[PDB]
Write a protein that binds this DNA or RNA. Structure first.
Ligand SMILES: [Mg+2]
Ligand SMILES: [Mg+2]
Ligand SMILES: [Mg+2]
Ligand SMILES: [Mg+2]
Ligand SMILES: [Mg+2]
Ligand SMILES: [Mg+2]
Ligand SMILES: [Mg+2]
Ligand SMILES: [Mg+2]
Ligand SMILES: [Mg+2]
Ligand SMILES: [Mg+2]
Ligand SMILES: [Mg+2]
Ligand SMILES: [Mg+2]
Ligand SMILES: [Mg+2]
Ligand SMILES: [Mg+2]
Ligand SMILES: [Mg+2]
Ligand SMILES: [Mg+2]
Ligand SMILES: [Mg+2]
Ligand SMILES: [Mg+2]
Ligand SMILES: [Mg+2]
Ligand SMILES: [Mg+2]
Ligand SMILES: [Mg+2]
Ligand SMILES: [Mg+2]
Ligand SMILES: [Mg+2]
Ligand SMILES: [Mg+2]
Ligand SMILES: [Mg+2]
Ligand SMILES: [Mg+2]
Ligand SMILES: [Mg+2]
Ligand SMILES: [Mg+2]
Ligand SMILES: [Mg+2]
Ligand SMILES: [Mg+2]
Ligand SMILES: [Mg+2]
Ligand SMILES: [Mg+2]
Ligand SMILES: [Mg+2]
Ligand SMILES: [Mg+2]
Ligand SMILES: [Mg+2]
Ligand SMILES: [Mg+2]
Ligand SMILES: [Mg+2]
Ligand SMILES: [Mg+2]
Ligand SMILES: [Mg+2]
Ligand SMILES: [Mg+2]
Ligand SMILES: [Mg+2]
Lengths: 91, 82, 200, 94
RNA sequence: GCUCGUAGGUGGUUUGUCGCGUUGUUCGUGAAAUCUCACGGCUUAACUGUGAGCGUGCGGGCGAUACGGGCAGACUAGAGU
RNA sequence: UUCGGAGAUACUCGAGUGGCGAACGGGUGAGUAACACGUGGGUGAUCUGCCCUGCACUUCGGGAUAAGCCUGGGAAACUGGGUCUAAUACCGGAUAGGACCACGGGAUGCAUGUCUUGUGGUGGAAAGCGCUUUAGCGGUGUGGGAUGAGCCCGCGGCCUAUCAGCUUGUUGGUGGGGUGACGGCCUACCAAGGCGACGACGGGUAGCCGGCCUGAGAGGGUGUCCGGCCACACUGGGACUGAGAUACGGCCCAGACUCCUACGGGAGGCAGCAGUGGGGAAUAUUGCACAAUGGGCGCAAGCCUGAUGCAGCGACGCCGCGUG
C-alpha cells in the first residue's frame, strides 16, 4: 500500500528524519512520493513539524502511517483531527 | 527452503486451470462447427451455453474478464453474421 | 602539527621581526644561515612566497589550512585581502593575544589548547576556533588564580587593545563588538601578494 | 445515506501533435507518406539547421496526391509504422 | 590543373498577412542528495539540517512583429535576352 | 495411575492441509548503440493484490483428499496402493447491470469515437471463525480515489565509408486469430512497396543518468561512494503459479563442471553477508544487535530480517589536534 514513514538522512550518529509519503515496496531511503514533515529525536524533547494539510490529504486518501509516524501524528493532533477525536493539539 | 509447498500447490493449480481452459476450447470449437453448418437452430443455444461457460471461467479466475468479453463478442457477432 | 622551532631564524629569513616582547631582537644582523650574507637574486616569485610565509608564521597556521582560508576569502563577497585578514584574525587564540592576555602568539596558542577558556559557557580547546560578532569569551572559572594567567592580570596596560574587541574588569572577559578590520589593525605585511601567489 | 455511484473527477483531454507537410508518396493502399521539415539551432555552433522527416499517415478514403500540403494529427499505432492520420488537404497541389 | 553542374548553403528594393524562428509574461515540470549564498548543530572543521538560488531546458495559455522564414503581390538597380 | 504408564476434553504445539508473503529488500555490470536511458508528451489502446471510500449482498447444497493407520517398491533421492477425516481447500445450483448482442435517446470531439442513459435478449459471486461479554476478525459483486505498471511518440547524448545497397512478414490493405491493451503480434489472400549520403546495412566499443574531476568560461575526461532507471543470476531455451515473474537462495529440458551410488540412478550453483583458492601492482572480519528506521505474517503480544544500525581491520582519503 502507501505508507507514511521515516527515512534516516542524518549522519553516523545524528539520525535526522524526514516524514515521507512512500509506497511500501520501496527501500527506506528511496524516492518518496512527497515529503510532508521532519522529525529530529535529539532536541529538548525533540523537533517535530508536519505539514498538517498535506498530512490530512494523505490520511484521507488512504495512506497508512507506520507506528512511529502514528505516534508523531498523535503528538501533533493531525491524527485526532482526521479521525474525529477531541484533542486536536497535544504537543 | 520450504518452497516445496508452493511447488505442490502450483502443480495442483496448473491441473485445474488446464482442465478449465480445455473445456472452454471444446465448447468454442463445437459452436464453430454449429455456425459453419449454419442451421441457426442449435447454435442459438450453443452460443448461450458457451458464453455462460466463458463467464464462469472468468469468475473462477482461470482467464481474464477482458478475454472472456473478447471471446463472447466474437462468437455473438459470428452468430449475427449467419 | 606545529612548527616548534627557533622563531628568530624564521624572522631572520623573512627580514622582519614577528615576535617582539622580551625576545624582541637577537641583537645582530640578518644572515639567516651560513650563506646568509649573500646579496642574492630577487625574483617576483620570491616576494609573493615570503609574504605568504609572513602571513602563515605570524599566526602559526599550516599551509593546508591557509589554503582553505584562501578559498574562503576569495569566495567571500567584497574584496580578498581584507577578508583573508579578517578570517585569519578571528581565530580565538589570536583574540586572546590581541586582548592583552598573552606575552606572545605561541603561549596564547598553548593557553587556548589547554582549554583555559569558555565562549558561551562552552569549553573550547581548539586554537583555530573562529570567534564571531557578539561573542563573549570567558576564562574557565576553575582555571584562574594560576600563575601564567594572573601574571597577565596586572600587565594589561602596555600593549593597546584594538577597537573591535573589549576587555573588562578583574573577571578577564572579552566582548566582540564586530568582526575586525585587520587592514586597519596592525598589518606587518601586504595582503595583495598572497592573492598573487595563489594565482600561479 | 452519493447513495449511488460517484460520477467521475473532471479532467482535461490531452492534446495530440498537429503538423503540416508535403505528400511524398501515395501508392500504398489507404496510406499516405508525408514529409515534415523542422529547423533547430545547432547545439554548439549556433546556426539554424533544417532537417526533414518522413511520417506515414492513414487514409480510410485514399484521396491525396503528390504535392498537396496536408495537416496531420498523431494517433495510436494504427500499424507497424503508421502513427498519423490525415486531417485535411489544405491548398491542394497545383 | 581548369570549368560546368546535382543535393545543400546563402540571397537585391518594396506592400500586406501568418506568427514557424525570435522575443515578453504566466502555469506545470526540471526528484532527493551533490553545487553556490545565508543561517542553524556537533568544543572548531570536515560532516550534518534548513531557506533561497541553480536546474541554461521542455510542454500549455496569453501578448509583439523590428529581423529571419512562409504565403500573395509589386519594381528594376543584380542576372539574362 | 504406571508406580513408569495412562486421559485432546484441555492452554500449548512438531509434522500436515489452507491464506498471505516469497516478484520487495540484497548483489553484479556480462549483454545491450536499443524508446535502454534523460527530458517532454500521449494512452478515446491498457491493467493494478493489499490500502481509502460510496452502494449492494453474504443464499442452498455435494463429492473428495493431505495428515493419520496398514502396506508395496528403491542404495539412496523418493515413490505406488488400501482404508480414514476436516475446513475460509474443491465442485454444482438460486438471485445479483458496469460481460455480451441488437435497437434507441442525451452530452460532448480528435477519425477511430468516448461518457451517461432506455428497451429487448443472454449471463456472471461470497465464508465463516472468535468473544473474561459494545473481546473482534472476516467474505463477494460493483462506482469512485490513491498507488504501481505496461505500451506509443518528439528531442538529446560514441568511433568507423579502407562498411553503398539493404529489405519479402519485408511495406501497406482486407477477413479472421491472439492480447490486459493498439499493432505483421500471428495467419490466409491481395497490392508492390519500405529504408538509404540528413549514412541505411555492417564492423568496433559501451550499462544510461543525477553527478564526479578539470577549466575564467565554453569545453574536455569520466559514470567509482550515494540516489534513480535498465539488464542479468553456471551457459542456452521454455513455461507454470500469481494482482504482479530476468522467478539470485522456484519448476522443466539440453550442455559444461563438482560430488554420491549397491551402476539401476541421484544432488548442486556465494555477481546475498562473512570467508577460501586463483589472477593480480593492488582492496577488509567466517564480528555484535534487532536498541532505532524500513520490510513480511498475525487482532495483538509477538516471530523473521547478514536490510539496516554499529563495531574490527587498512594514513586509503578529507578535516582537526598534539610532540610543549
Ligand atoms: Mg505456509
Ligand atoms: Mg480434448
Ligand atoms: Mg476479438
Ligand atoms: Mg593533517
Ligand atoms: Mg488495419
Ligand atoms: Mg540549387
Ligand atoms: Mg538557391
Ligand atoms: Mg531559401
Ligand atoms: Mg532578404
Ligand atoms: Mg535537486
Ligand atoms: Mg556553529
Ligand atoms: Mg512558454
Ligand atoms: Mg543590364
Ligand atoms: Mg506447528
Ligand atoms: Mg490471513
Ligand atoms: Mg505472493
Ligand atoms: Mg528480485
Ligand atoms: Mg554492463
Ligand atoms: Mg522518450
Ligand atoms: Mg493415504
Ligand atoms: Mg444467473
Ligand atoms: Mg458457492
Ligand atoms: Mg504472408
Ligand atoms: Mg490482419
Ligand atoms: Mg561490457
Ligand atoms: Mg582554457
Ligand atoms: Mg543470460
Ligand atoms: Mg561464477
Ligand atoms: Mg539459464
Ligand atoms: Mg496474490
Ligand atoms: Mg496466470
Ligand atoms: Mg530463466
Ligand atoms: Mg545464483
Ligand atoms: Mg545464491
Ligand atoms: Mg524466490
Ligand atoms: Mg562475498
Ligand atoms: Mg602481484
Ligand atoms: Mg598473486
Ligand atoms: Mg528491527
Ligand atoms: Mg521494526
Ligand atoms: Mg603507503
Amino acid at each position: 500500500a502507501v505508507k507514511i514513514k521515516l527515512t534516516r538522512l542524518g549522519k553516523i550518529r545524528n539520525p535526522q528524519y524526514r516524514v515521507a509519503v512512500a509506497d511500501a515496496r520501496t527501500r527506506r531511503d528511496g524516492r518518496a512520493i512527497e515529503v510532508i514533515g521532519r522529525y529530529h529525536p535529539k532536541e529538548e524533547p525533540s523537533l517535530i513539524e508536519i505539514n498538517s494539510e498535506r498530512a490530512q490529504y494523505w490520511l484521507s486518501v488512504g495512506a497508512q502511517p507506520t507506528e512511529p509516524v502514528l505516534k508523531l501524528l498523535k503528538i501533533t493532533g493531525d491524527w485526532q483531527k482526521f479521525k474525529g477525536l477531541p484533542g486536536a493539539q497535544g504537543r | 527452503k520450504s518452497q516445496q509447498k508452493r511447488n505442490r500447490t502450483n502443480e495442483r493449480a496448473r491441473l485445474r486451470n488446464k482442465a478449465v481452459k480445455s473445456s472452454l476450447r471444446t465448447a468454442v470449437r463445437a459452436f464453430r462447427e454449429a455456425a459453419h453448418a449454419g442451421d441457426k437452430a442449435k447454435a442459438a443455444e450453443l452460443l448461450a451455453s458457451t458464453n455462460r461457460k466463458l463467464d464462469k471461467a472468468a469468475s473462477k479466475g482461470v482467464i481474464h474478464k477482458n478475454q472472456a468479453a473478447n471471446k463472447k463478442s466474437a462468437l455473438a457477432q459470428a452468430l449475427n453474421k449467419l | 602539527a606545529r612548527y616548534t622551532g627557533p622563531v628568530t631564524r624564521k624572522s631572520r629569513r623573512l627580514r622582519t621581526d614577528l615576535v617582539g616582547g622580551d625576545q624582541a631582537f637577537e641583537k645582530r644582523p640578518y644572515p639567516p644561515g651560513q650563506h646568509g650574507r649573500a646579496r642574492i637574486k630577487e625574483s617576483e616569485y620570491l616576494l609573493q612566497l615570503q609574504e605568504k610565509q609572513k602571513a602563515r608564521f605570524t599566526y602559526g597556521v599550516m599551509e593546508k589550512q591557509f589554503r582553505r582560508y584562501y578559498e574562503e576569502a576569495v569566495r567571500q563577497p567584497g574584496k580578498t585581502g581584507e577578508e583573508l585578514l579578517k578570517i585569519l584574525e578571528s581565530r580565538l587564540d589570536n583574540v586572546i593575544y590581541r586582548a592583552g592576555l598573552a606575552r606572545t602568539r605561541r603561549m596564547a596558542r598553548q593557553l587556548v589548547s589547554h582549554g583555559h577558556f569558555n565562549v558561551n559557557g562552552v569549553h573550547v580547546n581548539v586554537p583555530s576556533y573562529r570567534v564571531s560578532q557578539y561573542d563573549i569569551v570567558d576564562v574557565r572559572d576553575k582555571s584562574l588564580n594560576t600563575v601564567p594567567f594572573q601574571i597577565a592580570r596586572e600587565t594589561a596596560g602596555e600593549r593597546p587593545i584594538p577597537s573591535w574587541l573589549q576587555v573588562v574588569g578583574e573577571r578577564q572577559r572579552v566582548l566582540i563588538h564586530q568582526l575586525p578590520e585587520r587592514a586597519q589593525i596592525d598589518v606587518p605585511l601586504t595582503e595583495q601578494l598572497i592573492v598573487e601567489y595563489y594565482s600561479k | 445515506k452519493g447513495p449511488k455511484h460517484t460520477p467521475r473527477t473532471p479532467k482535461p483531454r490531452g492534446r495530440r501533435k498537429t503538423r503540416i507537410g508535403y505528400v511524398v508518396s501515395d501508392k500504398m493502399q489507404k496510406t499516405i507518406v508525408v514529409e515534415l521539415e523542422d529547423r533547430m539551432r545547432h547545439p554548439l555552433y549556433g546556426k539554424i539547421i533544417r532537417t526533414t522527416k518522413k511520417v506515414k499517415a492513414h487514409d480510410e478514403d485514399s484521396v491525396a496526391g503528390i504535392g498537396d500540403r496536408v495537416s496531420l494529427m498523431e494517433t495510436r499505432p494504427l500499424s507497424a509504422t503508421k502513427r498519423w492520420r490525415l486531417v485535411e488537404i489544405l491548398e491542394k497541389a497545383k
